[PDB]
Design a protein around this ligand. Sequence first.
Ligand SMILES: *C/C=C(C)/C=C/C=C(C)/C=C/C1=C(C)CCCC1(C)C
Ligand SMILES: CCCCCCCC/C=C/CCCCCCCC(=O)O
Ligand SMILES: [Cl-]
Ligand SMILES: [Cl-]
Length: 264
Amino acid sequence: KNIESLFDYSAGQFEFIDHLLTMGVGVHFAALIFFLVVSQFVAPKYRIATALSCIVMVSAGLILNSQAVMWTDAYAYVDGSYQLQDLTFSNGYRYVNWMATIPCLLLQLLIVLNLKGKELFSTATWLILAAWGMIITGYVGQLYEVDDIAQLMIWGAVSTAFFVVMNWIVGTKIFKNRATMLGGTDSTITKVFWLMMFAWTLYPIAYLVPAFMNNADGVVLRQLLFTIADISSKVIYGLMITYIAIQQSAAAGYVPAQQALGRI
Ligand SMILES: *C/C=C(C)/C=C/C=C(C)/C=C/C1=C(C)CCCC1(C)C
Ligand SMILES: CCCCCCCC/C=C/CCCCCCCC(=O)O
Ligand SMILES: [Cl-]
Ligand SMILES: [Cl-]
């Protein structure tokens, strides 16, 4: 049902996709160790924001690892090209993983925005419902990326509606709560918003690849877009969230944060 299954791949195409996914694994688990060690310099009220980046690194790292092994399981070099064997490859499992990872990315944002108690719970709930609506409709849509492009497009339109509404909740909370933020991170959080807008928009672009580039090179392009998007939306984003958490920790008088920023 996925366009990947339609084509044979050159040695170059196959190996590049393998390297992309493997590099993805390496970057996420390397970042994991960074977030782990810096977590001790985060104040208790923000420390979960850094913990969530650790959780996202392993979740994303495992899905990329699984995709890479699925890639090599599914294809073998036969008569001059990599050809599909008995096992299958599908990006569908990425969608399932987003059900967990996207709420984690959203929650760590709400935490460094200094949302608390009732507002935190209600905002998270609405955000997660919007995100789940987006993911589920998108998942359904990509089931048709070979059989029914028109259906892919309509489910994609519905998903994009959830996407836009989710982004509106995010933007509204960011620009409303920007003023509460310490240590100059009122400035930084604005860049986080734009980073999110950029990186997350790469995913629906990948979703549409079967509509504008239905061939083996399109398959490569989609994996390339996922790689850019994953690293931007999880790793670079996580680094910014953690930087914001530490800076606010220091401004709030958390001594390990002050000491850590002092050594650099
Ligand atoms: C770490 C993974 C992330 C941040 C994934 C984000 C995914 C999206 C923003 C997906 C968006 C989609 C649309 C807006 C329309 C097409 C269907 C989706 C689900 C790919
Ligand atoms: C935040 C940015 C992260 C960047 C991740 C991407 C790193 C590797 C990028 C690809 C370079 C282009 C390689 C040329 C593709 C050859 C085409 C082919 O052989 O199939
Ligand atoms: Cl605290
Ligand atoms: Cl993920």
